[PDB]
Amino acid sequence: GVDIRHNKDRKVRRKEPKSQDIYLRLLVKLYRFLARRTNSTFNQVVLKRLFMSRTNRPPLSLSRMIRKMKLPGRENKTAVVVGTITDDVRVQEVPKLKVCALRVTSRARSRILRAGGKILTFDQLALDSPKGCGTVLLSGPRKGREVYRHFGKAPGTPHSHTKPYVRSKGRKFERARGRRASRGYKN
Amino acid sequence: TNTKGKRRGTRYMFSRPFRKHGVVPLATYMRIYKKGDIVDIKGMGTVQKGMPHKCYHGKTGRVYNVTQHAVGIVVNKQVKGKILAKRINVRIEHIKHSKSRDSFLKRVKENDQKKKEAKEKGTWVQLKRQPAPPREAHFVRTNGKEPELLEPIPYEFMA
Amino acid sequence: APSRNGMVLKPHFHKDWQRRVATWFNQPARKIRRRKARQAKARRIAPRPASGP
Amino acid sequence: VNVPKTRRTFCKKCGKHQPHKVTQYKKGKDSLYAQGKRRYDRKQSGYGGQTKPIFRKKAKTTKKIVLRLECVEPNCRSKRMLAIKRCKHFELGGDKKRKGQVIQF
RNA sequence: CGAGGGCGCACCACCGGCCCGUCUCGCCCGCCGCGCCGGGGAGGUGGAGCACGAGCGCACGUGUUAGGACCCGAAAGAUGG
RNA sequence: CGACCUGGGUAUAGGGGCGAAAGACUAAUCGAACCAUCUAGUAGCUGGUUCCCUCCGAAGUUUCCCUCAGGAUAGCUGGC
RNA sequence: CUCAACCUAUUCUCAAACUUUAAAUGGGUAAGAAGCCCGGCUCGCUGGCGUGGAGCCGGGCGUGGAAUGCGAGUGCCUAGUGGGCCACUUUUGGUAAGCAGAACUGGCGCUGCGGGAUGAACCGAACGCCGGGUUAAGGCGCCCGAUGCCGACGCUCAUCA
RNA sequence: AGUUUGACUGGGGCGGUACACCUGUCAAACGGUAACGCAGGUGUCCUAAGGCGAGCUCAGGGAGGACAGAAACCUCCCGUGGAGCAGAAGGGCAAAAGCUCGCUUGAUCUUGAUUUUCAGUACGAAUACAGACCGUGAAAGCGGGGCCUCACGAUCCUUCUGACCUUUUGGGUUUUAAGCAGGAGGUGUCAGAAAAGUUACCACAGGGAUAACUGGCUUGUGGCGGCCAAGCGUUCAUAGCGACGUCGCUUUUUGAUCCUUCGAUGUCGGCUCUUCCUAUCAUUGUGAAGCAGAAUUCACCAAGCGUUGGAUUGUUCACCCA
RNA sequence: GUCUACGGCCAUACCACCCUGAACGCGCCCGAUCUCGUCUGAUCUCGGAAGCUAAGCAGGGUCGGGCCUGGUUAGUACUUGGAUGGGAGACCGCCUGGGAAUACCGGGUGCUGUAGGCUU
Ligand SMILES: [K+]
Ligand SMILES: [K+]
Ligand SMILES: [K+]
Ligand SMILES: [K+]
Ligand SMILES: [K+]
Ligand SMILES: [K+]
Ligand SMILES: [K+]
Ligand SMILES: [K+]
Ligand SMILES: [K+]
Ligand SMILES: [K+]
Ligand SMILES: [K+]
Ligand SMILES: [K+]
Ligand SMILES: [K+]
Ligand SMILES: [K+]
Ligand SMILES: [K+]
Ligand SMILES: [K+]
Ligand SMILES: [K+]
Ligand SMILES: [K+]
Ligand SMILES: [K+]
Ligand SMILES: [K+]
Ligand SMILES: [K+]
Ligand SMILES: [Mg+2]
Ligand SMILES: [Mg+2]
Ligand SMILES: [Mg+2]
Ligand SMILES: [Mg+2]
Ligand SMILES: [Mg+2]
Ligand SMILES: [Mg+2]
Ligand SMILES: [Mg+2]
Ligand SMILES: [Mg+2]
Ligand SMILES: [Mg+2]
Ligand SMILES: [Mg+2]
Ligand SMILES: [Mg+2]
Ligand SMILES: [Mg+2]
Ligand SMILES: [Mg+2]
Ligand SMILES: [Mg+2]
Ligand SMILES: [Mg+2]
Ligand SMILES: [Mg+2]
Ligand SMILES: [Mg+2]
Ligand SMILES: [Mg+2]
Ligand SMILES: [Mg+2]
Ligand SMILES: [Mg+2]
Ligand SMILES: [Mg+2]
Ligand SMILES: [Mg+2]
Ligand SMILES: [Mg+2]
Ligand SMILES: [Mg+2]
Ligand SMILES: [Mg+2]
Ligand SMILES: [Mg+2]
Ligand SMILES: [Mg+2]
Ligand SMILES: [Mg+2]
Ligand SMILES: [Mg+2]
Ligand SMILES: [Mg+2]
Ligand SMILES: [Mg+2]
Ligand SMILES: [Mg+2]
Ligand SMILES: [Mg+2]
Ligand SMILES: [Mg+2]
Ligand SMILES: [Mg+2]
Ligand SMILES: [Mg+2]
Ligand SMILES: [Mg+2]
Ligand SMILES: [Zn+2]
């Protein structure tokens, strides 16, 4: 007998996409080969993002992509996102962008192309930059989800600002005892 | 079954040492406590204001806030299987500077200066402190004296 | 019993609901029947507008 | 306990210390038209008997004395409620105690 | 290959900033209604907030709950015969 | 030979009847008959709960509860 | 003259709720790059002062400032459980208990296997299906594997060994 | 008619509160740590016993002084606190925190942070700040209750106080009502139902988580022995006894416990019948004596054999007759 | 070599008794008009400078008490971890590490900071 613990032997991580999308599986095959047969760590990151779930591949708005592309030294670089690129109607000027995405919204696609931009899929990105040279790997806001407002410390604990689960919002719904000093306590 | 009183079981802990009662010496009030320095929480019983709780006596923390008479200390407390950093206000009577941090700062000043001097004259010197090494070989001289022969003594009944 | 975080739910199923349940399996048949009546009414008022006044 | 009938304490209306006139607070009379009383009377009417609990397990023997402070400044008659600790015997402006006096034989 | 240097995703810690409530202080501004009118500032603090959206619909799984509610089981209570 | 025994006909029906009184009797059922229904009544309690292999793997402790054969809560577990 | 009280210096014996003194085991912290050292700037706080303190901005320092071992950090959802029991040691009540109640670690519960004839908890050791070798604790007259050693030195006779 | 008739608990009931709190101890030198563990305490009290400042020194003892004495008052000396600080205890405290005076109301109005219990929820209590308005002192400062560790209470409802505040439903005025913020009226089963019994006429779901009867552990108590030998025995410790002590054994007493049994192990006594034990009443063989004989007593090997008939009582026991 | 004022550590500094003290100083001392307090100019407050180191104070002394620090007590008491060690138990021994406290016997009896004086 040996003195070890076996509760952490099996690392919990995606070794493949749980999706049955045959097109996603094809470009997983392409980037499984690229990650193995190159020393590019860019291919390793892209490959493991391809396995990720939809909640782990948040959409990237056009405004956020433009703002990251506008940073110094990123001219003539390809914006790579492993997910959906989304139109942001809050912006009025779209510059010229070279973009690779898993998926682009129709309105966002029209805006990028009309501004002289270029849109690539991940198969075309492999031919353009097999090692991912001259690319900016972007990601949508991972915690930009309603669930994360409810996560954290319990709402009925001091110094916790987490949203409780309520069927309705109003003066009659969970605004009394434990929420104000007049009604017992507040914390 | 035990009471939850704040000072239960502090009969001897907060009592003064023998023949050291009375007026608190004033050097304990003249000590300077900056932010980020390490202080030991004693908890003398002569001053009843700003006393630490019994679970912080003999604990060491880091000062994060300084007031007119007290300091704010971040001190680790273990509650069941979790250690969480408590923040407590303690009057300066119940704290004193920790010499563990003072000795290490002295060593850093020696280390940094010793490195500087070594570069100026050239050769390499040891900075890290090593654990007590095994004793080296040596000669023990008899000096013309035969070592005294010891013998266990017979037993006889004391009292 | 409550279990961890959740929404305080108040279902209105304390009133013997299973004896008053309205299924909609006749919805496709109802749409057909009204459409026959619409077509029959339009034929009856032959030149008059089908929708009415 | 004993408290004087007058004291100089803070007045929120004046924003400063002013002499105050100290009296004991009593609970006022029930309105009968308070919303809870109206709801209670509607609930009690008809059949069903007593519809709300009746305490009948008194344990306390004292009440927290509430002092009604009135600012004496005639422009400002603002009143405040001060609560002191529980006491069995409360007196308002009684005879002050002396020290070096013979206790009446 | 590469010492160094640069732009830095997401995310984390922290410091600022903005919106609503409420306190403290204080000085200005607006006019078809000069008012018991309207607006603005600084400093704390309360909010399930903002700070270049992530949601909606459908399906599946797990968990909790109301329903006969995993299955079988009272002593009883009521209505009408 | 009696407050005697007995047939038949009548009357009293369920929280009601009837009782020389035993809570007796009221269709083998009586300290509240029988039948159908509400009703698959409720049960923190007892009993049961149906194929295989692989991997991980506990707790009987904290706090609160008309709480002490039960829950909530933290802890310990697994999965992602 | 004697016996007392009292005082003084001694003397016998003690304390879970006494103590001058005071362990072992034990609890906290530190052993650097978030550090050190140079300059400078901001403040409505502080102020004899270019003060004090805090914050901010640049620059230079790597011998990475004990040993040993190990890859870490972080989030969501969550079942079962919430009758325990036993052993060494510490330990409370009790005459005591296979009694009742705590502390610490391990175990049984959830665990098979070798040994203790037998046995939840002892001793050894933890387990996929097998071959060879060797052991642990325990054993080697026979049951029953192994002393069928020319084993060593003594002790002991029991008519309940 | 409907309903209720707490909980803990070496079974339940009765008794207690170990049900909300506080001190010392248990507790094994951080902290935490249980038993209907030990010793106690709490539901109050205080316009001062709160807050400042000043000035003093306390308990006790010695020596003196009219009435005066063991204690009345005055004086000196010693006095580490051996006093006092409201109360239980512990800690703390001397030109203090104690005593006496003087002036006072910081026991006032506010927002957050933190500690304690802890889930790191609440209440309660507490600590350090910050913003007002004050008190005291010459001032530094100290004070937002009591030297510290306890002295206390949610939602709903009611009551009072505050904003020339909000709403009061088509608009306006005024009552009224509702609201916002802060106190109070209380839940002591103290995180907070509104609650009397009885059942042997009883019922159901369960429980060997839990009593009554056997068994098991234990052996205080009961019973039976041993060691020492101060004494008893005219005399003489030990023929026969055995005080003060002390070591055991037994499970035919009674307790202690609750491990097995609550989908059931038929619960006293007697009758009948068998067997077993020996700690032997008799009988066989013996040793001892305060054994002359007779009788009796102590002890050994020893359970082969026997140990009865009756009155009263259900009795086991008991007592008497023979 | 000392002192005064303010101190830090707070007896190696305290307590009892004895001896010495030059110069400044600190005191004792004289007085009560003013300031201020008293039953009392005793204390406190104020105004002084005849006298005195008697006292405080400083230094020294005592087979002094205390205190401080060593030795002994003693590798003893106690103790972490270990054993299919001993013993009926009570307890005890050993292995592996740590390790006290009285009595008894020695040594010591304030160091020092800032500012200002005296000491031929
Ligand atoms: K993980
Ligand atoms: K206790
Ligand atoms: K206690
Ligand atoms: K269900
Ligand atoms: K019927
Ligand atoms: K007849
Ligand atoms: K009936
Ligand atoms: K129970
Ligand atoms: K759980
Ligand atoms: K649970
Ligand atoms: K303890
Ligand atoms: K609190
Ligand atoms: K002041
Ligand atoms: K109110
Ligand atoms: K309760
Ligand atoms: K016995
Ligand atoms: K027995
Ligand atoms: K039993
Ligand atoms: K049974
Ligand atoms: K008989
Ligand atoms: K008989
Ligand atoms: Mg293995
Ligand atoms: Mg495993
Ligand atoms: Mg206080
Ligand atoms: Mg911020
Ligand atoms: Mg859930
Ligand atoms: Mg009913
Ligand atoms: Mg069913
Ligand atoms: Mg049924
Ligand atoms: Mg309750
Ligand atoms: Mg069960
Ligand atoms: Mg259970
Ligand atoms: Mg339990
Ligand atoms: Mg036990
Ligand atoms: Mg038990
Ligand atoms: Mg089990
Ligand atoms: Mg296990
Ligand atoms: Mg096993
Ligand atoms: Mg075996
Ligand atoms: Mg055996
Ligand atoms: Mg083998
Ligand atoms: Mg064998
Ligand atoms: Mg053989
Ligand atoms: Mg009970
Ligand atoms: Mg301990
Ligand atoms: Mg302890
Ligand atoms: Mg004073
Ligand atoms: Mg203030
Ligand atoms: Mg309670
Ligand atoms: Mg009857
Ligand atoms: Mg049992
Ligand atoms: Mg004799
Ligand atoms: Mg059975
Ligand atoms: Mg049977
Ligand atoms: Mg039978
Ligand atoms: Mg015999
Ligand atoms: Mg001496
Ligand atoms: Mg040893
Ligand atoms: Zn006023």
Side-chain angles (χ1 to χ4, degrees):
Chain A
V2 306
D3 167 55
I4 46 182
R5 254 157 54 84
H6 298 284
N7 63 326
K8 304 268 164 269
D9 283 346
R10 188 176 65 79
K11 310 182 186 179
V12 193
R13 63 205 190 292
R14 285 267 178 110
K15 284 178 286 308
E16 80 200 85
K18 182 175 282 291
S19 174
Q20 299 299 317
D21 178 357
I22 57 171
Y23 289 85
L24 183 82
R25 295 228 159 216
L26 274 195
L27 60 83
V28 159
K29 286 177 185 198
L30 160 64
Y31 267 91
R32 212 185 278 275
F33 180 70
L34 281 168
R36 193 182 79 237
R37 276 289 291 283
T38 56
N39 56 359
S40 169
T41 43
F42 172 82
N43 295 323
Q44 277 164 58
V45 180
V46 162
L47 169 70
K48 97 194 163 196
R49 290 214 204 298
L50 288 172
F51 304 157
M52 270 176 223
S53 70
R54 194 189 272 207
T55 56
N56 286 317
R57 292 181 288 101
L60 182 53
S61 78
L62 202 66
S63 51
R64 203 176 203 106
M65 181 158 75
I66 290 178
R67 208 165 57 180
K68 302 313 161 170
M69 286 301 104
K70 201 177 298 305
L71 296 176
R74 310 192 164 183
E75 314 93 15
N76 321 304
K77 288 196 183 177
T78 313
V80 183
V81 57
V82 188
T84 299
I85 277 167
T86 292
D87 184 25
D88 207 314
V89 310
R90 291 173 299 205
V91 308
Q92 328 279 334
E93 287 305 320
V94 180
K96 186 175 184 169
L97 297 173
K98 194 183 177 63
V99 166
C100 177
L102 215 55
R103 183 178 181 271
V104 182
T105 286
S106 84
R107 207 156 55 172
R109 167 183 317 265
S110 60
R111 289 188 84 192
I112 291 165
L113 292 178
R114 184 206 282 88
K118 187 174 192 65
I119 299 181
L120 315 174
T121 58
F122 269 104
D123 54 285
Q124 299 174 340
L125 177 79
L127 293 181
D128 203 66
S129 76
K131 293 197 187 180
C133 292
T135 53
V136 181
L137 184 45
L138 293 180
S139 186
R142 194 78 88 75
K143 278 189 156 88
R145 262 175 81 220
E146 168 74 354
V147 297
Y148 289 102
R149 276 160 207 259
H150 300 281
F151 299 159
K153 281 187 53 185
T157 52
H159 315 316
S160 87
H161 302 310
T162 78
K163 182 184 265 186
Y165 293 105
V166 288
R167 63 176 193 261
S168 305
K169 196 197 269 188
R171 63 147 192 110
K172 290 194 305 184
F173 306 99
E174 281 176 52
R175 293 196 188 286
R177 171 183 176 284
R179 286 279 187 186
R180 53 190 66 232
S182 66
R183 297 299 191 283
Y185 63 97
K186 167 149 167 41
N187 77 4
Chain B
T1 304
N2 279 340
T3 62
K4 280 155 171 33
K6 313 158 176 298
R7 278 178 67 144
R8 161 175 79 77
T10 71
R11 175 193 180 133
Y12 304 126
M13 173 165 67
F14 290 158
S15 73
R16 299 300 301 138
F18 183 58
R19 291 189 311 120
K20 300 195 93 62
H21 299 250
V23 186
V24 172
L26 268 62
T28 76
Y29 292 112
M30 291 156 204
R31 311 282 175 183
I32 300 312
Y33 295 105
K34 299 291 179 67
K35 269 163 201 161
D37 60 24
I38 321 292
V39 296
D40 309 323
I41 296 97
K42 181 63 67 68
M44 87 188 312
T46 295
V47 179
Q48 292 88 37
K49 272 194 171 310
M51 285 189 93
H53 194 244
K54 88 186 93 163
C55 50
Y56 304 105
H57 184 115
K59 307 280 173 266
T60 310
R62 158 179 55 81
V63 172
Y64 81 91
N65 181 57
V66 191
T67 48
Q68 279 81 11
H69 306 107
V71 296
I73 302 147
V74 176
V75 57
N76 290 342
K77 184 179 184 184
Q78 171 170 348
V79 184
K80 281 96 171 171
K82 48 174 172 164
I83 296 175
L84 59 84
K86 301 282 269 186
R87 295 159 90 103
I88 58 163
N89 310 112
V90 184
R91 279 179 96 105
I92 58 179
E93 287 93 317
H94 318 277
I95 59 150
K96 68 186 185 302
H97 282 283
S98 174
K99 292 168 56 179
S100 53
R101 164 61 43 176
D102 281 321
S103 83
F104 157 73
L105 266 57
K106 182 268 290 180
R107 169 159 77 85
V108 166
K109 295 310 200 289
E110 199 287 331
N111 271 352
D112 279 5
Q113 181 278 340
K114 184 174 96 175
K115 272 155 70 41
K116 181 167 304 312
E117 182 276 346
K119 299 289 196 276
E120 281 162 16
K121 59 89 178 178
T123 199
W124 187 98
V125 65
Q126 165 79 350
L127 278 290
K128 295 176 159 58
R129 53 215 166 84
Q130 291 299 124
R135 252 192 307 287
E136 82 292 355
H138 53 277
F139 289 81
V140 177
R141 297 182 27 109
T142 47
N143 299 301
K145 291 191 305 301
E146 210 57 15
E148 179 199 346
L149 163 73
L150 307 179
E151 284 196 354
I153 56 152
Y155 165 63
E156 62 87 20
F157 168 41
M158 295 298 102
Chain C
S3 189
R4 291 206 196 70
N5 207 1
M7 193 173 302
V8 173
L9 298 166
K10 288 210 188 285
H12 290 46
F13 292 94
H14 297 96
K15 215 196 272 196
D16 192 5
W17 57 280
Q18 284 176 117
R19 214 163 59 81
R20 303 170 297 280
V21 173
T23 44
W24 284 58
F25 303 126
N26 56 331
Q27 161 181 50
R30 192 209 301 289
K31 297 173 74 61
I32 288 166
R33 171 186 322 123
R34 313 206 218 200
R35 194 187 152 208
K36 282 174 80 183
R38 257 187 308 270
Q39 290 165 331
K41 178 187 57 203
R43 272 178 259 126
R44 206 177 64 239
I45 51 179
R48 303 179 194 75
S51 282
Chain D
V1 311
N2 186 75
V3 298
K5 297 181 193 278
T6 185
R7 85 155 76 183
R8 189 167 151 289
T9 194
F10 188 84
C11 189
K12 313 179 62 166
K13 183 95 178 306
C14 307
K16 58 192 273 198
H17 281 82
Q18 297 274 58
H20 279 76
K21 189 178 177 297
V22 172
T23 49
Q24 181 159 8
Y25 151 83
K26 299 295 187 291
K27 161 162 279 198
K29 203 190 160 191
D30 292 348
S31 175
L32 189 154
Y33 289 117
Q35 53 99 28
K37 181 54 164 146
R38 271 144 47 201
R39 179 172 315 108
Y40 182 65
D41 286 7
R42 173 70 172 277
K43 204 189 176 83
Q44 290 281 100
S45 75
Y47 295 101
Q50 184 59 35
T51 62
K52 302 294 290 289
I54 306 162
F55 182 40
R56 67 185 67 187
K57 271 204 217 286
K58 182 168 176 60
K60 297 285 183 293
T61 65
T62 68
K63 301 188 187 308
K64 298 185 189 177
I65 303 296
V66 176
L67 308 163
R68 176 181 181 266
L69 318 174
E70 200 190 306
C71 179
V72 302
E73 192 278 332
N75 290 358
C76 172
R77 320 309 310 287
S78 50
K79 306 154 192 56
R80 197 142 47 74
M81 299 281 131
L82 268 187
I84 58 190
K85 293 186 188 177
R86 303 169 162 284
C87 74
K88 285 198 209 296
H89 315 291
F90 171 82
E91 170 63 4
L92 207 52
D95 277 320
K96 285 175 169 296
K97 62 179 98 158
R98 282 80 43 76
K99 284 179 180 291
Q101 297 296 317
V102 298
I103 315 295
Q104 167 50 242
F105 175 35

